[PDB]
Amino acid sequence: MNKEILAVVEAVSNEKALPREKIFEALESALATATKKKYEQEIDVRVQIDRKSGDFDTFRRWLVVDEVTQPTKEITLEAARYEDESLNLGDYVEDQIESVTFDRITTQTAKQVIVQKVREAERAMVVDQFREHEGEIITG
Amino acid sequence: GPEEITADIPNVGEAALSKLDESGIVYIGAEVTGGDILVGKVTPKGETQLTPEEKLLRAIFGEKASDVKDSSLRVPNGVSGTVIDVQVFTRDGVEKDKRA
Amino acid sequence: QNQRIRIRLKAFDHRLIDQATAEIVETAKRTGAQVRGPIPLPTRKERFTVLISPHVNDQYEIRTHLRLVDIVEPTEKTVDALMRLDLAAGVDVQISLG
Amino acid sequence: AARRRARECAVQALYSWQLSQNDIADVEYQFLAEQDVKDVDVLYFRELLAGVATNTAYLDGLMKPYLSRLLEELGQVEKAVLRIALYELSKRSDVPYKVAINEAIELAKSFGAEDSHKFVNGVLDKAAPVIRPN
């Protein structure tokens, strides 16, 4: 799992565009979007795969707001009593642990997120890389 | 690409994959009905990307999650009943399956 | 990869030719290619003409200064930076690979 | 035509190194094995490549002021032909004043900007107090 994504960032050619840290952040985003399909519940699942130390540990956001629709991510503006949360906003839980990071749709959305983010990053790089020469004769 | 009979199907929900076993075939006794999935098969769908920088990704990190397509054998619409037997003819060289 | 990228350079100007050859060997070095000698071969005369409304009963003579550059280690940077940095007109760049 | 046409071929290697900043051994090896140049005698090629000695830079420093064209804008072909036209009697003096001067001006007549040999001959006035065997 974690080792797999480490092998990714090793095989990632544009390691400057995405070194291990932001690689694993984008992969946590992909894992949340995958949990979006694993559960009909639309919950923001931060994971924090522990980029280099060990494997992942899924969490569950609380999306602090006075609402209760989709209660997987609903907490009022002071509900931090149990768990010693003590935080009004930002207090997010780790109730569900060890989702799937190896199945078909997981790896498919991993591919999609990887190619999307890599292409976006290379675009944003070349933009400034050529903007450097603003005021010169360029081909085209 | 080759054809595999894996248990997972990229799109369908849990119901359509509940009858199968861990290998991807229904148990002997599941009272299926027209529409359900007997197998259990996926195919290499896509073609012509030609980006080896992504082929190296999906050769180890997406080795079997590249070009899925659910050309899986469903019971024809209308015919219900009970599954009573499953034969599996495997071409030699092709290794094996658990049900086999 | 394969070696002989041999550049011929016809020309009618002088200073831009020195500039072009210098920046060419510069790019080769920024790549690492084993740039051969530019080797300025003997200048060749050319009797020119004026194919416009003539005199009544003139670009007639010119001196083609030639250059013979060679790149025999064409990695990515050579062709990349070469096709990137264009060269001024008035000079001919008939190259060869063979 | 063997020692005469020798210099009009080693000026090539001189200019080549000057543009390449390699070693003279590199450029001479590549020039010889590049085209089979027999207009130069091998030992006179060796002498002309020995014509990269430090004194060559020195003959640039002497004739520096009385140059009708500045140093930092002179053409590299003109740099090479000037180094040779001054070195012809720095140490070698294979032929006297007029012979070597005419050699440099003619055997390199087909390399300049249609007038360069004029002003190199004109700077050769500053070459007088060092080309003593007139």
Cβ contact A104–B60 (<8 Å): no
The domain total for chain C is 1
How many angstroms separate the CA of residue D129 from the nearest CA in chain C?
31
Domain span at C39? 1-98
Handedness of CA A126, A128, A129, A130 (dihedral sign): positive
Q: Half-sphere exposure (CA, 13 Å, Cβ side) for D36? A: 0
Instruction: Answer for the pair A59, A98: CB distance below 8 angstroms, yes or no.
Output: no
User: Is residue C91 a contact partner of residue C17, using CB atoms and an 8 Å limit?
Assistant: yes
Partners of A137 on chain C (C-beta within 8 Å) are 86
Q: CA A32, CA A44: separation in Å to the nearest integer?
A: 6
Q: Please, is C77 exposed, middle or buried when counting C-beta atoms within 10 Å of its C-beta (0-12, 13-18, 19+)?
A: middle
Cα–Cα dist C94/C3, whole Å:
17
Q: How far apart are CA B39 and CA A123, in angstroms?
A: 43
Q: How far apart are CA A23 and CA D113, in angstroms?
A: 60
Q: Is B98 helix (H, G, I), strand (E, B) or coil?
A: coil
Cβ pair B62:A13 closer than 8 A? no
| CA–CA distances in Å: residue C97 to residues C2, C36, C71, C73 | 9, 14, 10, 12
Q: Which helix (H) or strand (E) holds D19?
A: helix D7-20
Going by the DSSP 8-state scheme, the letter that residue A135 receives in this structure is S
Chain C interface disruption, residue of D7, D18, D110, D119, most C CBs within 10 A: D110
Report which DSSP code applies to D71: G
Q: From chain A, pick out residues whose CB is under 8 angstroms from the CB of B56.
A: 11
CA D36 vs. chain centroid, Å, equals 21
CATH no. for residue A58?
Answer: 3.30.1480.10
The Cα B76–Cα B33 span in angstroms is: 9
> By C-alpha distance, which of C63, C68, C64, C61 is closest to C93?
C68
What is the rounded CA–CA span in Å between residue D73 and residue B53?
Answer: 49
**DSSP secondary structure string for all residues of chain C:** ----EEEEEEES-SHHHHHHHHHHHHHHHHHT--------PPPEEEE----SS-------EEEE--EEEEE----HHHHHHHHHS---SSEE--EEE-
Which pair of structure tokens corresponds to residue A47?
A: 């994971």
At C7, list the tokens.
């550049």
Spatial neighbors of B82 by CB under 8 A, at least 6 apart, are: B29, B30, B31, B32
ω into C90 cis (within 30 of 0) = no
A139 touches chain C (CB under 8 A): yes
Asked if C66 contacts C10 with a C-beta cutoff of 8 angstroms, the reply is yes
Contacts with A64 (C-beta within 8 Å, 6 or more apart), sequence order: A75, A76, A77, A88, A89, A90, A91
Measured between its terminal Cα atoms, the distance across chain B in Å is 22
**CA distances to B26, B41, D58 from B83, in Å:** 8, 18, 102
Residue B11 CA to residue B13 CA, distance in Å, equals: 7
Q: Do chains B and A touch (3 or more CB pairs under 8 A)?
A: yes
Report d(CA A59, CA A31) in Å as an integer.
11
CATH architecture of B1-94: Beta Barrel (2.40)
Burial of D82 (C-beta count, 10 Å sphere; 0-12/13-18/19+): buried
Q: Assign residue B29 a region: left if phi > 0, alpha if psi is -120 to 50, beta otherwise?
A: left
Inter-chain contacts counted by CB atoms under 8 A, chains A and B: 40
CA C92 remoteness from chain centre: 6
Q: What's the sign of the alpha-carbon dihedral B60, B65, B71, B76?
A: positive
Q: What is the DSSP letter of B21?
A: -
Resolution in A: 3.8
Technique of determination: cryo-EM
Q: CB of A17 within 8 A of CB of A105?
A: no
What's the CA gap between D79 and D96, in Å, rounded?
Answer: 22
Distance (Å, whole) CA B91 – CA A115: 37
Measured CA to CA, the distance from residue A56 to residue A6 in angstroms comes to 12
Distance CA D80, CA D108 (A): 10
Residue ranges of domains in chain B: 1-94
